[PDB]
Amino acid sequence: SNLEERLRACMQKLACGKLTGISDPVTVKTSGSRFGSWMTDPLAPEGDNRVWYMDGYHNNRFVREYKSMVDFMNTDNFTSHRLPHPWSGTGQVVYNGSIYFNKFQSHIIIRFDLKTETILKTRSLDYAGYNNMYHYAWGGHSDIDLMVDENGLWAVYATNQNAGNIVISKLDPVSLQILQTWNTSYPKRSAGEAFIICGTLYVTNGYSGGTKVHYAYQTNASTYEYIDIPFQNKYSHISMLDYNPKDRALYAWNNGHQTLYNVTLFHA
Amino acid sequence: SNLEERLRACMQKLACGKLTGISDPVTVKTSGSRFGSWMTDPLAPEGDNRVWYMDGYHNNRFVREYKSMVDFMNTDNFTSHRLPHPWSGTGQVVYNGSIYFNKFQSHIIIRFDLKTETILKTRSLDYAGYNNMYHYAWGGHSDIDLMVDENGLWAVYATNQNAGNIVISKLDPVSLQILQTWNTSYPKRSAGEAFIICGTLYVTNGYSGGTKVHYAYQTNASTYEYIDIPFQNKYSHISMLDYNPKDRALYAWNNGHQTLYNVTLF
Ligand SMILES: *[C@@H]1O[C@H](CO)[C@@H](O)[C@H](O)[C@H]1NC(C)=O
Ligand SMILES: *[C@@H]1O[C@H](CO)[C@@H](O)[C@H](O)[C@H]1NC(C)=O
Ligand SMILES: *[C@@H]1O[C@H](CO)[C@@H](O)[C@H](O)[C@H]1NC(C)=O
Ligand SMILES: *[C@@H]1O[C@H](CO)[C@@H](O)[C@H](O)[C@H]1NC(C)=O
Ligand SMILES: *[C@@H]1O[C@H](CO)[C@@H](O)[C@H](O)[C@H]1NC(C)=O
Ligand SMILES: *[C@@H]1O[C@H](CO)[C@@H](O)[C@H](O)[C@H]1NC(C)=O
Ligand SMILES: *[C@@H]1O[C@H](CO)[C@@H](O)[C@H](O)[C@H]1NC(C)=O
Ligand SMILES: *[C@@H]1O[C@H](CO)[C@@H](O)[C@H](O)[C@H]1NC(C)=O
Ligand SMILES: C[As](C)(=O)[O-]
Ligand SMILES: [Ca+2]
Ligand SMILES: [Ca+2]
Ligand code: NA
Ligand code: NA
């Protein structure tokens, strides 16, 4: 049981490569307000296709849980979980059964276990801005963006000591301690969103109109480059874009729609 | 236990990289004739540190088994296994309990199970040269060279349809079928020795003198480049150079000496 998860994690790392393409988005659902996030747990056991869904970016503490991806498309059946604190932004992630989010109007990260419904850890992000200071271009208190890739848990934010440029920190999923930190050269307020695939942070140019990935920072070498990978902004406003390594897709909240993007990675 | 093997094979592939260096050799044993091969199974279970030893490039069918590396260094304590046919060259490999070798005066490959002492599979290598035809630069009927890396079992040889240039084939360890073939443009006669690391074939400039790895063929892209990775030829003649994925080292038969090189990957 434990060796299977160790093996699948190794297989994912072996199939890693540079982002070369983003296919056309599929519309999974039309629901919610203009802003929000949705996601699945890439470390979910066999079965367990539960979709987690958080509407809005402010003073909403209710998380919806859908049974599966198909029940998320066609039905409105769900159970609601009340978080002890409201989240800020749409930067939450669900990882190995716990939801990680930014506490409302703070730089505090909270790990909340979804089965027993209890706070497991609370830790402030050192020098991270908050309260619409280093938001993504679309605003909405998106100062801190937590995400998961083939390597584990990550925090994307910005600090005053870095002139408001994006900072990447690898997090420990249990202690929430910063294991390593990279200073990028990209202003977080000028990015429309960001996502990490295989240790590489990809940053988009904006949130409306003709969007593209145009900056990549490689953490394995602390190098960066400007690129041009366009993707279709089907409903013209994107407020959430995150990669899921289990199904190699970007999850997006797009102007009151929930959409999915297949990605292409380089494989010799 | 099967997933432990499956997880370890994944971990090895994930730790792969480009060859960047070869350390100074260490002389493990002084024995044997001018030509031969020695190796360990990269897929031996824990507790199996057996060293396998084959003296000569012809007229010998007796494989020696030593208990461990330390018994190989300091003792002459070994068991003899008599193969059903003599081997050709020094390009044998031991892999997951079987020995793979080229049968004397033929291009046939034989998989021989060591514990049951049984031939498990026989198959002619397709279009491969034999009998001192497309040998390495040192000769010794080394027409066909079987090797193992992180990805499994390989066969390096030359064909006439490839104008005498090195051909690489990935083999199935059970059926001995050719899964995929790559045509290089490196003339096998000019190759001193060759070995595969992480799907890349490395070819040395000679079996003698100031030896150097100077050619790398990347099978993941069918491209090649010229490199410069010098290593010391302690005893002036090398009849065997094999990579072992488990210990990240090169095993060599250096003119009656058995030596080991550590490799550095990127
Ligand atoms: C919602 O759930 C109820 C009870 O669990 C079930 O009877 C009903 O069919 C479900 N509706 C949909 C649309 O899935
Ligand atoms: C996921 O959680 C289980 C127990 O709930 C733990 O044993 C396991 O190590 C965790 N996996 C990771 C990758 O942290
Ligand atoms: C990032 O920048 C801050 C302040 O500019 C500095 O204290 C820290 O050492 C930097 N870290 C790296 C990895 O460059
Ligand atoms: C991604 O590709 C898979 C298989 O090619 C397909 O089943 C799935 O529908 C695709 N999803 C998107 C959003 O393109
Ligand atoms: C071989 O092993 C025996 C005992 O098993 C020992 O007495 C003998 O000395 C060993 N051979 C050598 C060359 O040391
Ligand atoms: C090694 O041999 C065993 C037979 O005992 C087999 O089950 C296993 O799959 C083999 N391993 C490889 C990598 O071929
Ligand atoms: C290699 O060359 C032979 C003949 O020269 C040809 O039949 C074969 O298809 C070639 N293989 C590849 C992979 O190019
Ligand atoms: C190779 O490296 C290992 C560990 O660094 C060491 O124990 C061994 O002696 C080295 N062997 C050679 C031949 O340098
Ligand atoms: C999308 As806004 C101006 O409420 O941060
Ligand atoms: Ca994101
Ligand atoms: Ca060799
Ligand atoms: Na996120
Ligand atoms: Na060999």
Author numbering:
A (entry chain A): 212 to 479
B (entry chain B): 212 to 477
Reproduce text from the manuscript describing this model:
A dimeric variant containing part of the coiled coil and Olf domain, corresponding to our previously crystallised proteolysis fragment, was designed with domain boundaries 212–478 (UNIPROT numbering). This includes Cys221 that forms an inter-chain disulfide and covalently locks this construct in a dimeric form. We crystallised the dimeric form of Olfm1coil-Olf, after deglycosylation with Endo-H, with calcium chloride present in the buffer. The Olfm1coil-Olf structure reported previously was not deglycosylated indicating that the glycans did not contribute substantially to the crystal packing. The β-propellers in the Z isoforms are covalently dimerised by an inter-chain disulfide bond (formed by Cys221-Cys221) at the C-terminus of the preceding coiled-coil domain. Only about a third of this recombinant Olfm1coil-Olf sample formed disulfide-linked dimers as in the crystal structure, yet the monomeric and dimeric fractions could be separated from each other by two rounds of SEC (see Materials and methods section for details). The switch loop forms part of this top face in the calcium-bound state and alters the properties of this surface. In the calcium-bound state the top face still consists of conserved residues and is devoid of glycans. Another putative region of interaction is the crevice between the two Olf domains, flanked by β-propeller blades 4 and 5.
Olfactomedin-1 (Olfm1; also known as Noelin or Pancortin) is a highly-expressed secreted brain and retina protein and its four isoforms have different roles in nervous system development and function. Structural studies showed that the long Olfm1 isoform BMZ forms a disulfide-linked tetramer with a V-shaped architecture. The tips of the Olfm1 “V” each consist of two C-terminal β-propeller domains that enclose a calcium binding site. The highly conserved monomeric Olf domain has a five-bladed β-propeller fold with a central metal ion binding site.
